[PDB]
Design a protein around this ligand. Structure first.
Ligand SMILES: CNC(=O)C1(N2C[C@@H](C(=O)Nc3cncc4ccccc34)c3cc(Cl)ccc3C2=O)CC1
Ligand SMILES: CNC(=O)C1(N2C[C@@H](C(=O)Nc3cncc4ccccc34)c3cc(Cl)ccc3C2=O)CC1
Ligand SMILES: [Cl-]
Lengths: 305, 305
């Protein structure tokens, strides 16, 4: 029993965190094999960050301009290149702690673990989701840039996020490990705002199924709904549209609990129109949307890494 | 900006998790130096569990009765002893991944990270607090026994909890790393129940101070309160009594925000009276009590918004 927001064990990722310094800027880097990946804005001064021509800033730099530190050992940069918004620093030594890895681009609604670092030192780990507006409601301070998001499959670490900036509403923006941003954001000190957010419907439903598994059935009713009728109600409460793919994905949870997906949708329809009425689901007074159907199944089965 | 429930990086602990088998029972063990620590109920059957004589069960065991597995390597047990509710198995190999560590006993309200394991394999990490009733609202399944709670402060891993059992209300009970239980519990399958739980007042206050640091003041009022008058109201809402020690501990947060502890106590008195009225504090519709005053200073910035 018990349902907590759970992150993946961060050990495989901790052994990859290095500190990258270019002039006055200091942020985090991911050391995989003989390459260190970090945000390209490390070459930017507070003057440059306004309208930076990154190719022009990088062409002036030499390898010795980049100081890379792994624990207490200094790494020797022997080459540098740029891929989108990420800077790739070819180092002299291959990381002996390099795990089995992949660079994957995650979709909105999909969750991941974040290893928050400052000066190449992991300070904390937390789980979070890629919002439909492409921001992440993370927990970062100055120096957190270059912190990474990841998932674990078996022994394979799937890198999906690198931190770049904080938006004026306190939410966060970053890129996949190939330097391509998530969302309509650019790596510049300019006026940027997150788009209006929506609730991840398939994740709320999965979290309602998780509550049924933990013996919370007060919200269940005798009613069902059509997929079209549920989406008309959901669109009115700023919920993401539920697709047939979402219904199919909730199949195993529906089979395990005995509550059809459209039956569980009629319970969510009632929670949206009437509220909780002083009640909680899994100790929460709000409908939680940062647990995917796979996260629920993994936490209610005991999958190890 | 941003305030998340954050666990410590689990890497230093992952390198200590081993699988311990005695007959038919299989649970987790903590391998530090040449000793593996695990719940003593690994020598028990489900028949023994009602009224087990552990000294009588252990005297009938030899070293080769205990199978210890570290990854894919088998460890050779060369000695065994019992310290309270923990079984200490002396092994032939010292753990090369042994971090700097300490065994610390915590008090209710103290938080810690849990590395949930099954068959000596870490499956997840989550943050949680020692409840005033000495239970932990964890997330554990069968086989999780021997999973550990810890805090990594600076370069030292402070082991504070080892998982032993789940109570009928779904909450969890365990011991410190010296085998002494937290609470009035025994490692017996007997009719035992958790005492009535209470809210950790000093932690809720710290979390209100964290919200003020992140630029939220909607809950503050022009009132102050005496310590006794606040406790009379707090007891009525099942909140732990706030002591002078608690007030002193909130000193740095009170100094940083400019809101005296008894002024923040008056805001809490009003919050319990009025509820939130559709509003949230740090993205929560409930008053959070699993962040200590120390956690808030560690996670939040030194400059208030
Ligand atoms: C809110 N930050 C700022 O005002 C500043 N900023 C710095 C940086 C950025 O956002 N860093 C952060 C990232 N995560 C959490 C932060 C918390 C607190 C301060 C900074 C944080 C950044 C990067 C890029 Cl690609 C584009 C623009 C900026 C940028 O504007 C400082 C000027
Ligand atoms: C909930 N408990 C049980 O179903 C049973 N049980 C077994 C065991 C125990 O609690 N194991 C678990 C530990 N953490 C999470 C569990 C979740 C689900 C099942 C088991 C779990 C145990 C150990 C000790 Cl020292 C004292 C009592 C028990 C005990 O009562 C089987 C009866
Ligand atoms: Cl303590």
């Amino acid at each position: 029993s018990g349902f907590r927001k759970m992150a993946f064990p961060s050990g495989k990722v901790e052994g990859c965190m290095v500190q990258v310094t270019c002039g006055t800027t200091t942020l985090n880097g991911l050391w995989l094999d003989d390459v260190v990946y970090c945000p390209r804005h490390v070459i930017c001064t507070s003057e440059d960050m306004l309208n930076p021509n990154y190719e022009d800033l990088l062409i002036r730099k030499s390898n010795h301009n980049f100081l890379v530190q792994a624990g207490n050992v200094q790494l020797r940069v022997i080459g540098h290149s740029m891929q989108n918004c990420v800077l790739k620093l070819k180092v002299d030594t291959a990381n002996p702690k390099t795990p089995k890895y992949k660079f994957v681009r995650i979709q909105p609604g999909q969750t991941f673990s974040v290893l928050a670092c400052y000066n190449g030192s992991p300070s904390g780990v937390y789980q979070c989701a890629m919002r439909p507006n492409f921001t992440i409601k993370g927990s970062f301070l100055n120096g957190s840039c270059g912190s990474v998001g990841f998932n674990i499959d078996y022994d394979c670490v799937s890198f999906c996020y690198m931190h770049h900036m904080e938006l004026p509403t306190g939410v966060h923006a970053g890129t996949d490990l190939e330097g391509n941003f998530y969302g309509p954001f650019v790596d510049r000190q300019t006026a940027q705002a997150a788009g209006t957010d929506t609730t991840i419907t398939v994740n709320v439903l999965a979290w309602l199924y998780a509550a049924v598994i933990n013996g919370d059935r007060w919200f269940l009713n005798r009613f069902t709904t059509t997929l079209n009728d549920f989406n008309l109600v959901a669109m009115k409460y700023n919920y993401e549209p539920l697709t047939q793919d979402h219904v199919d994905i909730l199949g195993p949870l529906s089979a395990q609990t005995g509550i059809a997906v459209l039956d569980m949708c009629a319970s969510l329809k009632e929670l949206l129109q009437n509220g909780m009425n002083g009640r909680t689901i899994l100790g929460s007074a709000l409908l939680e949307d940062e647990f995917t159907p796979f996260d629920v199944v993994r936490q209610c089965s005991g999958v190890t890494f």
